[PDB]
Design a protein around this nucleic acid. Structure first.
Length: 122
DNA sequence: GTCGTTAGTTGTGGGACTAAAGGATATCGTGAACCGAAAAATTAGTGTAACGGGTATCCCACAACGCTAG
């Protein structure tokens, strides 16, 4: 069956449901920290998904090697030790865990790794 | 005999002359010379290119997951 839906987005205002000011402020500061960690994360993922392609290019300029993004346990020419999205998610979680939730990391990882493969041509 | 009055001319001046349509004209004669006025035309003079961050907008492409284990 075809897609019988069209994606849509709505803006819902939310207040923090706490009695006192200090708890609300603690939650709001935690969420601002979440913002900062998310942006630093996005930077880390994009750098870490740039570098390896240029390592591929380096090897190809060395001996025309056909190195490709795949787990070496599943590919002879693979260099990665796991799935690429897992590599970015790991290299961001190992540093930013315990401060902001990991679902933000997973969503950001998917959102950037999906687009970067399309941007490979450019 | 003479002077004002009245009526009847007599000459002279001012005012009329359907309605409807249409509706073209041609218009001489010559004396000079200098000064002033304003309206017009010609001429003389000055010139950019990219750059730093930071941020307002545009076009243009893509995303907006699903499953398993502690």
């Amino acid at each position: 069956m075809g897609k019988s839906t069209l994606k849509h987005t709505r803006k819902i205002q939310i207040l923090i449901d706490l009695p006192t000011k200090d708890e609300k402020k603690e939650v709001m500061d935690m969420m601002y920290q979440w913002r900062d960690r998310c942006f630093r994360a996005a930077n880390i993922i994009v750098t870490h998904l740039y570098v390896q392609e240029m390592i591929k290019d380096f090897f190809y300029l060395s001996e025309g090697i056909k190195y490709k993004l795949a787990d070496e346990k599943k590919d002879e020419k693979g260099i990665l030790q796991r799935s690429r999205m897992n590599t970015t998610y790991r290299v961001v979680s190992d540093r930013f865990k315990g401060e902001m939730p990991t679902n933000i990391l997973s969503t950001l990882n998917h959102g950037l790794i999906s687009s970067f493969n399309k941007n490979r041509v450019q």
